[PDB]
Amino acid sequence: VTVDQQEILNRANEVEAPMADPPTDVPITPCELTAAKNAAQQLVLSADNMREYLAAGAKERQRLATSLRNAAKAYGEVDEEAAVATAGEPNFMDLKEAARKLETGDQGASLAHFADGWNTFNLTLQGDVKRFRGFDNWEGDAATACEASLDQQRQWILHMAKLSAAMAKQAQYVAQLHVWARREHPTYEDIVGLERLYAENPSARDQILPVYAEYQQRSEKVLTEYNNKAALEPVNPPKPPPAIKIDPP
Amino acid sequence: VTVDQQEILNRANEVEAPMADPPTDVPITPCELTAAKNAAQQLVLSADNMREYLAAGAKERQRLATSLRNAAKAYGEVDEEAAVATAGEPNFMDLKEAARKLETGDQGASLAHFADGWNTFNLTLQGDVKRFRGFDNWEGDAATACEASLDQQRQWILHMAKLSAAMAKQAQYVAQLHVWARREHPTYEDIVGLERLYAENPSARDQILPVYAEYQQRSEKVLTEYNNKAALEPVNPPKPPPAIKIDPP
Amino acid sequence: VTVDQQEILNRANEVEAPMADPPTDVPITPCELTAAKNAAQQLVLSADNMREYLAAGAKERQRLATSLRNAAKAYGEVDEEAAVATAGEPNFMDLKEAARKLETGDQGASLAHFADGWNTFNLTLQGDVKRFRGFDNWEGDAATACEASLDQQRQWILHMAKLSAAMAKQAQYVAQLHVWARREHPTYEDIVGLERLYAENPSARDQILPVYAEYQQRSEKVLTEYNNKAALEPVNPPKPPPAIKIDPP
Amino acid sequence: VTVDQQEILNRANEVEAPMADPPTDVPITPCELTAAKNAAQQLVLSADNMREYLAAGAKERQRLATSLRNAAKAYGEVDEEAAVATAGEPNFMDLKEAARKLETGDQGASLAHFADGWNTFNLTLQGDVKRFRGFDNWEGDAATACEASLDQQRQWILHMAKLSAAMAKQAQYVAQLHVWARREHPTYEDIVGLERLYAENPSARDQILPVYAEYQQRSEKVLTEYNNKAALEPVNPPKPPPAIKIDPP
Amino acid sequence: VTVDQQEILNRANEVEAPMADPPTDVPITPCELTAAKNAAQQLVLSADNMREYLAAGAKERQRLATSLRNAAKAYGEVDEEAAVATAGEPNFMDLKEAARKLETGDQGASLAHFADGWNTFNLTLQGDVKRFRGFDNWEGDAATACEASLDQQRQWILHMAKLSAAMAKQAQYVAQLHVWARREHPTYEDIVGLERLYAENPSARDQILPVYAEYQQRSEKVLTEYNNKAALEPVNPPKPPPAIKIDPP
Amino acid sequence: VTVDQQEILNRANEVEAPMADPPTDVPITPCELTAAKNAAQQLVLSADNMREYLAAGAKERQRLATSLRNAAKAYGEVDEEAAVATAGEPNFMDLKEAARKLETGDQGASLAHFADGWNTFNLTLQGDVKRFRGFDNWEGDAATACEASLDQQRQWILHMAKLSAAMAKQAQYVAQLHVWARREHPTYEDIVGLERLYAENPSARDQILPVYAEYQQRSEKVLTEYNNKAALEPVNPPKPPPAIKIDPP
Amino acid sequence: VTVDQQEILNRANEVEAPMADPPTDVPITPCELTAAKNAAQQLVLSADNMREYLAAGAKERQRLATSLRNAAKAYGEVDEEAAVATAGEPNFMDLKEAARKLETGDQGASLAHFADGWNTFNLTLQGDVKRFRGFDNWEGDAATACEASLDQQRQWILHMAKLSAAMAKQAQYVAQLHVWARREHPTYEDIVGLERLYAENPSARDQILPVYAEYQQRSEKVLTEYNNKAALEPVNPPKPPPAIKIDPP
């Protein structure tokens, strides 16, 4: 019905305008435990996957804009503008090492900043999908296939926003886990103090001994818990759907 | 059986009469927590999606009315009418900041007004579906395909009403969460009072210290809970089914 | 085997005899809460849907009777017979308003009458399905297709009876919810009495204050519970299956 | 292998010999509650459905016997042998009415007799399926299709026996529910006695009042429970499978 | 590869050698309760089904042996070798009758003997399946189809063994239920003794009365429990798979 | 690419080299209870099934080696190298018999040795699957089909190892059950001692009687538990996949 | 669009560059229990499977690089550069043996080192998948099929990383199980001490005897628990997807 070729060209420019940049904050391990460091490296890898697939999606949108320009060419002309030591003795050396690892590092501040950035990116991605709306005037069959391709791009972007939210939730979960670990695990200073209450009271040991044994058991329940809850699934984003290909007329 | 062309024309006008406008209330964050603000922005985005897809549905109904007019043209004539500082000291600065964020903002009044508007819209949408009923007299095959298309429009509208209800439930859930957070989290004035009971009693500290430690723990359980329950799924409405296309005779 | 054309004609009259009328009681909101009023309006809408689809089913049965008459015409002749103010003070104004809304209205009597009518209609519908039985003597292929069409009408009617039961259960559930809400929510007279025990004892307030705080908390747990359990699904009856179409011979 | 035509004729007579009659006991409501009466009417309707579908199955078996006679005709000759008043006062009038309804009627004796009859019918139906066994000597393709048709009749009869058991279980469930209701609901004589302990002791009321309030609450929990557990699903038996049709030779 | 016709003939004799006879013990009701008698009759019917289907399987194996003999005929020659009174008073007459029914009958000895026989039959059936093994030398396509048919016979026999185990478990379950019923239900002699402590102490009744009421309640919980757990599913064995048919050469 | 016929011949010899022999330990019943003996016989039968299917798999591998030799023949030449008494009295005779059965037999030592052998066989089977690896140099279509056939043999062997583990777990479960039964069931010597404390104290019986009644109840809970947990599923190994057949060239 | 043949050649070299070597640490049994040794052998076998399938994947990548070189040959020229004793007495000999087995061996240090190596390998594998990205300039149909083949290689590598994580979790689970077993099982020195408190106090035995019986029961609960939780599933990696085959031009 005297198709607006200009509408198609304008939508082609709008489709492949750059979207907001994903965050680039680096999540640091909250402590020196191996499970914590592995969780941080998993988060780094997942953020790398997200950035790579977002760039791939921008390439898909560029191809889609090209196909829309080719479809607009079927109505005429386009003016292309742009060109140990002892048996039986309390360890205290493993307990002390566990506490030392738990209290070294930023305790999860980096994780929280990471999660805030990706939650913001989830909202930002959801805000930028008017570029995939249907057309006002253009109809037919090039139009319907183009509309389906744009809606596929929209669904993929929404899925990417959901994955951003999931990765941010994972970072927050690891941060909460570290906070819980700091709370129930016995303090380094408490351990050192109880260790001096075993070299400054050979007499008193039958009060010091069960206390140590409590501390030991708590340490074991924390580290083990830390090791099991901290294993994270990698985020595995789907590849963006291939744009509809439309040859020049 | 001497088909009522007039019935088809009347149904065409009735199908694409404007439906009730969706609500336009803006949901405000109930507090200054990041989770609360992100929940409010998620609600804003979901309401935007709902309004956009409702407008798209009205366009689909306009196309359907055109197809019904074309089908009526097969029986003759239509008269087209219309044209920090220290180690080991109590923080009190993070606790105080948490309380300050919890008590600033409207505490959920805006959320409740938002939810009421969308619940009302759910009922309003369900009340406006007589326009998709079957025909009295028209039968045949244009009639049956047209009836199927109208029932598809009806099912899509019912699904949109259900989604309106779901979004309103989400707003109410966030409001209830904020109310719970206000209840169990320690008050700003209680925190300030306990902080003056630590600069006006250096003596008394071994009674003040565990009390603080209780407050701290409660603060941590509230904020964390607030952060996890407040993440909302976006509302993702299905695109309205394409109207049946019927060319002029 | 010398087919009883008379049996087919008699079954045609029996198929489209009018069934019992659905109930027409209007369910009133049991109170002035918004959730209660929305539940009542949802029930009104669902009853409207049920009445509309039952009328559509009667139209389907009329078409089926016509097809049976056409099938009877293949054996000969048919003789067509028929032609707030202060910070820190107790509210008492929200508590009092909540109680006032809870005790105004019929408290669920209308809901119970509604539910009784629809439960009776469930039984009534199940009692009227002998009209869809198979035939005594007529066999063949018109007969088998007609029998299948009648059984489809029977299954649809049974499903409608089941939906009637479900809607009645929903009305009873809302009535039971309102009864529970009346029980645990603090009485209006108790609230007014406790409010006069705060203007006639400035002295006594440190006994009055926690009592209020209990009442407040109970009010919050009731209203919130009322708001969440009272959201009802709309009843969405399936469209009656299209009758088998059989042209005159 | 010189097929026993006589075996086929004997099996034809055995297939359509009359099976045991279903029970005809009428289940009466155990009390005057609406839920109880509706449950009894549901049981009456389900028993009607069962009797109707059993008669339909006997008709199917008669058709099957005819098809077996037609199949026997392919080997030769068959000799066809056969030819309120105040605010704030205790009700006592709703409580008393509830007790009166609970204790009137047979208390479930009729339900138990109904259930025994249908359980017996379940066993009786399972005992009568030797008539659907495979053939001794007849083989081929008429024989295999006939064997499949007989096994379909057997499976349908077994399903009907299972449904008989289910309906009997429903009757027993309603009877057990009424027994539980009689136990926890406050007695009519206890209610009348407590009501005379409120007109023969205006003094004593602050001991009588909470007692009433207990009774009231118990009444509400019983009736409501009675109303919810007593809603029964209708028994919906499948139509018997159509017999294999075999024309005379 | 110079097929062993003798191996096929030997396997034909081995396939249709008689298997072990199923047990023929009759399970008797453990008591005089209706639920117990119905459970015993259900077990009788299930054992009848099992015996009937086992005989049918032996017929299938006989047909399979015939098909193997026909397949062996394709290599040459086979030498065919073989040729109440008062209101308000304690009942004591229903309680006494319940106890009398519970203690009459063999208390489950017959059930245990039944279950032992069928468990033994499960093991016996599993021990007799070497007759369905694959062939040593015979290969090709008659051989592969014959091997598939033999494996189908093996799978059916294994399923029948599993069903034998299930039926034995049902008998054991009913026996255990009766033992539990004997334990918690009040003894006949205890009932008679308490009934004489109500005609030999009109004085003492306010100690006798609650005791009776306890007994009554226990009786009701036992009989009801007995009625619900004792309903058994019929065992419904699948028909044996049809043997592969192979005509003489 | 100048296919290594020698590689195919070497793989043919490696494929059908004998695998490790399955264990041959016989599991003995741990006691004289019928459930224990039936469990032992079930284990014997399952081990028989496993040995039979493992021998069948070795035959399948021999056929596969033949097919590989035939495939190697397509490149030229292969040099074929190789050529009671009283009512109301305590029983003590059933209790004593139960204890006697529980303590006779090896108490599960044979079961543990059986389970160790089959767990070892699980590991042994998993260690011998390098013979099913893909080929170094041979490619094409005979090679790919041969590789698929070898991988099918590998998957079947892994499934057989898993079944070996499952059968060993069943043996360990029965052994643990017998150990539990020995612990909670009353000792034979304790029973005999308590029986002499009933013939050497007619006076003392009202202390002896409840004690017996405790023992009786414990006996009943053990034997019943022993009977229900000891029923074992037969191990039903899948038939090995048929080797790919490849005729000589 | 003047395809970059050089890009395809560079990607061919990048695809089949060697990936990081899997770890080669040998997991040792943490103790002398049979379940522990079997778990260690299962871990050894699973690590062997992982190493074998990783080498197979490298072979698949080498084939893929060859196919990419063949596809690059369709645009011209490639310069191939590279060329016991008593009844009734306490055992103490089984208890002592159980403790001795529990405390011998490295107690799980080897398991922890194994798990760390494989968790590191999981992260390492996820870091090396840029070699499977899509192409910059090459498009068409060889390009799209090649891109699909590369993405299949990527998905298989990600699955292998996930399996590495799972195997490491299994090793950590067995290590945690052994730690729990050491904690609740009675110490060897405690057993020896209690055994000397039975040869140096014949008097005292009625205090020593229940203590032993406690120890015995604890031993039984530990070993049994150790035996059941320690059975590990083998890791069964999928075979790498076959590379796309592309013949020279």
Q: How far is E127 from chain D (nearest CA, A)?
A: 28
Q: Which residue has the tokens 């006589």?
A: D6
Q: A58 to chain G, minimum CA–CA distance in Å? A: 13
DSSP for residue D1 = -
- Token pair 């190994």 is found at F237
Whether F231 and E116 lie within 8 Å, measured CB to CB = no
Yes or no, beta carbons of G172 and A239 under 8 Å apart: no
Contacts of G87 in chain F (CB under 8 A): none
Approach to solving: cryo-EM
Residue F113 domain-assigned (yes or no): yes
Whether residue E243 lies inside any domain: the answer is: no
Of D45, D56, D227, the CB nearest to C123: D45
Give the other-Cβ count within 10 Å of B75's Cβ.
16
Residue A207 lies in a domain: yes
Task: Provide CB contacts within 8 A for F144, sequence distance 6+.
Answer: none
Interfacial B residues in 137-166 facing A (CB < 8 Å): none
Alpha helices in G92-134 (DSSP H): 93-103, 109-127
Residue E145 CA to its chain's centroid (Å): 33
What is the spatial distance between Cα G164 and Cα G127, in angstroms, rounded to a whole number? 14
Q: What is the CATH number of the domain that holds G54?
A: 1.20.1260
Window 193-222 of F: residues touching E by CB (8 A cutoff) are 217, 220
Residue position matching structure tokens 């005979």: F142
Let me know: does D83 contact D169? Beta carbons within 8 Å.
Answer: no
Name the one residue in this structure whose structure tokens are 């979004």: B167
Of C52, C224, C234, the CB nearest to B126: C234
| Nearest alpha-carbon partner for A64 in A2, A137, A136, A131 | A131
Do the Cβ atoms of C243 and C61 come closer than 8 Å? yes
Determine the residue type at E248. P
What is the residue type of F115? A
All chains having 3 or more CB pairs closer than 8 angstroms to chain C: B, D
How many interchain CB pairs under 8 A, C with D?
A: 28
CA distance E122 to E166: 9
In chain A, residues with a C-beta closer than 8 Å to the C-beta of G179 are: 220, 224
Q: Is the dihedral of CA E126, E128, E131, E133 positive or negative?
A: positive
Residue G197: phi and psi, rounded to 5, are -85, 20
Residues of C in contact with B120 (CB under 8 A): 38
What is d(CA D12, CA D72) in angstroms, rounded to the nearest whole number? 9
With a CB cutoff of 8 Å and minimum separation 6, the contacts of E43 are E27, E111, E114, E167, E170, E171, E174, E232
Are the beta carbons of E90 and E198 closer than 8 angstroms? yes
Using a CB-CB cut-off of 8 Å, the residues of chain G touching F179 are 220, 224
Domain count of the fold of chain D: 1
**CB atoms D169 and E45 under 8 Å:** no
User: Is C238 part of any domain?
Assistant: no
* Residue that the structure tokens 């309906």 belong to: D167
Between chains, do C231 and B169 touch, taking CB under 8 Å as contact? yes
- Evaluate whether residue G95 is within a structural domain: yes
d(CA G40, CA B24): 65
C-alpha distances in Å from residue F61, one per residue of F15, F17, F151, F247, G246: 6, 9, 12, 16, 33
CA angle D195, D196, D202 (to 5 degrees): 95
Helix (H, G, I), strand (E, B) or coil at B236: coil
φ, ψ for residue F2, nearest 5 deg:
60, 65
Interface contacts (D, E; CB < 8 Å): 28
Could you tell me which residues come within 8 angstroms of residue C119 by beta carbon, excluding any fewer than 6 positions away? C164, C165, C168, D34, D38
Determine the Cα–Cα distance for residues F99 and F189; give it in Å rounded to an integer.
Answer: 9
| Yes or no, beta carbons of B176 and C224 under 8 Å apart | yes
Chain E contact partners (≥3 CB pairs within 8 A): D, F
Q: Is residue C242 part of a domain?
A: no
The rounded radius of gyration (Å) of the Cα atoms in chain F is: 29
Query: A126 to chain B: nearest residue by CA?
Result: B45
Query: Two tokens at G49?
Result: 């499977």
Contact D102, D185 (CB under 8 A): yes
Residues ≥6 apart with Cβ < 8 Å to E59: none
Q: How far apart are CA F63 and CA F16, in angstroms?
A: 9
**Which of A32, A33, A34, A84 is the best residue to mutate to test the G interface, defined by the most G CB atoms within 10 Å of its own CB?**
A34
Nearest beta carbon to residue B45 from set A123, A134, A172: A123
Residue A149 near residue A133, CB atoms below 8 Å: no
- CA distances (Å), origin F158, targets F55, F190, G9: 15, 49, 40
Is chain D touching chain G, with at least 3 CB–CB pairs below 8 Å? no
List the single best residue of D122, D135, D150, D169 to mutate versus E (max E Cβ within 10 A). Answer: D122
Question: Measured between alpha carbons, how far is residue A108 from residues A36, A40, A115, B216, D54 in Å?
Answer: 10, 10, 11, 17, 72
Residues of A in contact with B38 (CB under 8 A): 119-120, 123
The count of CB pairs under 8 A between chains A and B is 28
Return d(Cα A217, Cα A206) in angstroms, integer.
17
| Given resolution (angstroms) | 2.3
- Phi, psi dihedrals of residue C233, rounded to the nearest 5°: -75, 140
D234/C127 CB distance under 8 A: no
Mutate: best of B107, B111, B123, B189, partner C, most C CBs <10 A: B123
Give contacts of D 34-73 with E, CB under 8 A: none
Structural element, H or E, at residue C135? none
Q: Which chains does B contact via 3+ CB–CB distances below 8 A?
A: A, C
Chains C and F touch (3+ CB pairs under 8 A): no
The token pair at F230 is 């000891």
Range of the domain at D131: 5-229
CA-wise closest residue to B188 among B32, B19, B15, B21: B32
| CA–CA separation, F77 and F64 (whole Å) | 19
Residues of D within 8 A of E228 (CB-CB) are 172
Contacts of E42 in chain D (CB under 8 A): 123, 126
Residue G132 lies in a domain: yes
Residue E185 — φ and ψ, nearest 5°? -90, 145
d(CA E156, CA F96): 42
- In A, which residues are within 8 Å of B56 by CB distance? 134
Chains G and A touch (3+ CB pairs under 8 A): yes
Residue type at D70 in one-letter notation: N
Contact E29, E36 (CB under 8 A): yes
Residue to substitute from G45, G63, G218, G246, interface F, most F β-carbons within 10 A: G45
Put simply, the answer to whether B231 touches A123 (Cβ < 8 Å) is no
Q: Which residues contact C154 (CB under 8 A, 6 or more apart)?
A: C129, C132
Q: Is residue D57 within 8 Å of residue D160, measured between CB atoms?
A: yes
Count how many pairs of residues, chain F against chain G, have C-beta atoms within 8 Å: 28
Taking the C-alpha atoms of residue B217 and residue F208, their distance in angstroms, rounded to an integer, is 58
CA dihedral F24, F28, F34, F39 (to 10 degrees): -40
Rounded-to-integer distance, Cα E119 and Cα D114, Å:
36
Q: Classify residue C241: in a domain, yes or no.
A: no
Cβ-defined contact of E169 to F34 (cutoff 8 Å): no
Give the CA distances from residue B99 to residues A115, B187, B193, D86, in Å, rounded to whole numbers and listed in that order.
22, 6, 13, 50
- Write out chain A residues lying below 8 Å of G169, CB-based: 231
**Nearest residue of F to residue G87, measured between CA atoms:** F189
Do the chains E and A touch each other, judged by at least 3 C-beta pairs below 8 angstroms?
no
What is the distance between the alpha carbons of residues E32 and F23, in angstroms, rounded to a whole number? 52
